[PDB]
Amino acid sequence: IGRIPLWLVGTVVGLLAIGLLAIFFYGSYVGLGSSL
């Protein structure tokens, strides 16, 4: 309890989520559905 900060937990979760949406948006221009 309190060994890792809740703010740091939320921050690393937000970094992972933003990077997840980023690679999702990147994968729209290449591969399947790239319209090319």
């Binding site: 399947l32 559905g33 790239s34 319209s35």
Partner: protein, 336 residues
């Protein structure tokens, strides 16, 4: 000591004792919207057919020329004039003014001044009554939508003929050709606006249900159960806690809307910001920013186009493209 005429005038304007508060924004309230409403009523009743598209094809739009109120509409200004500010005095005749769509510019400009001054008048009464003034800030969303549909879209597309017809079937026509030329349904701002009105209906029903549910016995099956005490008492005992308890026990007990102030703030801001988003979406459509065009985006390993729902929407969009403003085109691709 208000023994001078303009001091008494400013006192009567500023006073809240009138049935409808006029105010210093009210001095532009009253004449602009009475002008707009008078021209609207007279045009909708007995206006001659208006050449909207500039190809000598007039839309009747007025009841006395043979249409009901569902299909009747004050037709937009002509395409020949564009957004060139053509009022009565710039017309050689009243007949010419009516043929080129002058009442549309009249009503639209006066309605724009009226809505901005209604914003200001809401703030003004808020100031004279000493409340918080952000009711006008909340009303800033439907007025944003009105400006975007009425003046900003004609500014972007180049002509007031592009604006919303003042009617119902004209509204449907404008909406359909809007989808045809801009793909509004597949735009995130429009999705935000649709989510905003859906959530507005949802949260309005939810708030009404939670307040009307959290009540105590004071009105029985009769008109009022006042036998305990009649009117003339300040006992506030409606309910405070059970509505929030029900809302917590509904799903997961951590959606904290115990603060009724926060609840009402969210209740106001969600549809307001979403209508802001869709109004800005329409204004962006004015400058041809369009929607998501994922047509022919799904292809197989051989590069052959695989159809999809977006392709079906594209087919419907081009179907409305090839029908609207029947004989307005001369040149292949459609440019504003």
């Amino acid at each position: 000591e208000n023994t001078s005429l303009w001091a008494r005038f400013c006192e009567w304007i500023t006073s809240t004792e009138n049935r409808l508060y006029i105010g210093w924004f009210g001095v532009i309230m009253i004449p602009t919207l009475l002008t707009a409403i008078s021209v609207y009523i007279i045009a909708f009743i007995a206006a001659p057919p208006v050449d909207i598209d500039g190809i000598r094809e007039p839309v009747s739009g007025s009841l006395l020329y043979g249409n009901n109120i569902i299909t009747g509409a004050v037709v937009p200004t002509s395409n020949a004039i564009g957004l060139h500010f053509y009022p009565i005095w710039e017309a050689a005749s009243l007949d010419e003014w009516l043929y080129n769509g002058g009442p549309y510019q009249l009503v639209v400009c006066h309605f724009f001044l009226g809505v901005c001054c209604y914003m200001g008048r809401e703030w003004e009464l808020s100031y004279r009554l000493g409340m918080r003034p952000w009711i006008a800030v909340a009303y800033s969303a439907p007025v944003a939508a009105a400006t975007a549909v009425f003046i900003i879209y004609p500014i972007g597309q180049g002509s007031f003929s592009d604006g919303m017809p003042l009617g119902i079937s004209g509204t449907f026509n404008f909406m359909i050709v809007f989808q045809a030329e801009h793909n509004i349904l597949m735009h995130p701002f429009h999705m935000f606006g649709v989510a905003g009105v859906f959530g507005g209906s949802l949260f309005s029903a939810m708030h009404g249900s939670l307040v009307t549910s959290s009540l105590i016995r004071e009105t029985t099956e009769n008109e009022s159960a006042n036998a305990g005490y009649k009117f003339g008492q300040e006992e506030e005992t409606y309910n405070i806690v059970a509505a929030h308890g029900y809302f917590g026990r509904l799903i997961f007990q951590y959606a904290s809307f115990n603060n009724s102030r926060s609840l009402h703030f969210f209740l106001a801001v969600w549809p307001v910001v979403c209508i802001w988003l869709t109004a800005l979406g329409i204004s962006t459509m004015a400058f041809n920013l369009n929607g998501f065009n994922f047509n022919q985006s799904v292809v197989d390993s051989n590069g052959r186009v695989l159809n999809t729902w977006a392709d079906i929407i594209n087919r419907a969009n081009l179907g409305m493209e090839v029908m609207h403003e029947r004989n307005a085109h001369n040149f292949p691709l459609d440019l504003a």
